[PDB]
């Protein structure tokens with residue numbers, strides 16, 4: 001039978017809280033009580049959020065802003081030579097309209113309003129990890145489930161999980177691009193009511209495009225994956241020449257394991273967002 005799926009944007013209220021502040025043993029904040037309480041604060045904001053609410057604005061601490069600034073400064077040195085053209089086109093729009101600065105962490109509500117105007121994408125704060133079914137279902141309504149907390153200050157350059165720096169620097173500039181927004185939405189649409197098997201394959205395709213994708217533009221390899229765009233070391237590695245790269249091909253890509261604690265073993269290159277979108281259309285017919 002077909003599993004429940006959201007039919008309108010407010011139905012995400014019923015799955016966005018089905019979370020699967022619970023830090024892993026190796027988390028840099030695992031023994032930090034103050035950070036643990038800060039994380040509970042953010043998780044509660046997300047749990048209490050309902051569709052239609054303005055996303056609660058947060059007063060970030062000086063420490064949090066310094067962590068953001070450190071990451072922001074170093075990544076921005078690399079984007080011109082590493083990021084895809086769509087990313088580079090939209091980043092300055094975010095400095096102008098959403099307050100992307102070294103000494104200011106943008107508010108999710110402002111970013112959500114910006115995205116709504118540009119592509120109809122919006123943000124929903126999320127407490128933590130959701131099933132791939134629930135997470136991808138948001139994309140069907142152009143909703144990006146977004147973390148609001150900041151990584152621990154002890155290691156600004158590495159995070160064991162998504163944090164708001166990753167969301168804001170990695171994902172948002174491409175969600176502002178219509179071709180990419182359509183590509184993303186169609187992953188979500190394909191997932192709705194799909195088999196467990198199909199959802200898992202869509203999630204892996206999502207991982208190797210939206211999170212760790214490369215693309216070819218004017219003959220050059222460029223980065224569009226958000227996980228790369230917010231990781232200084234892997235961003236450099238991905239275009240270093242020491243990385244294994246393969247063409248994006250959903251039937252093959254979906255067989256690849258998604259690594260968490262290390263660099264990826266392989267990156268997949270899309271010809272364009274339009275082509276990646278076409279390839280997913282062909283693929284989803286075979287699994288759904």
Ligand SMILES: CCn1c(=O)[nH]c(=O)c2c1nc(Cc1nc3ccccc3[nH]1)n2Cc1ccccc1
Nearest residue numbers: 128129130131132133135147161162203206211227
């Ligand atoms: C389709 C896989 N997938 C899933 O099945 N469920 C998710 O909830 C999910 C996700 N993917 C991302 C977003 C995400 N960005 C990442 C960047 C680097 C490494 C892992 C990432 N997960 N999320 C959101 C998320 C993940 C962990 C903690 C908080 C929020």
Ligand SMILES: [Fe+3]
Nearest residue numbers: 162211226227
């Ligand atoms: Fe991500």
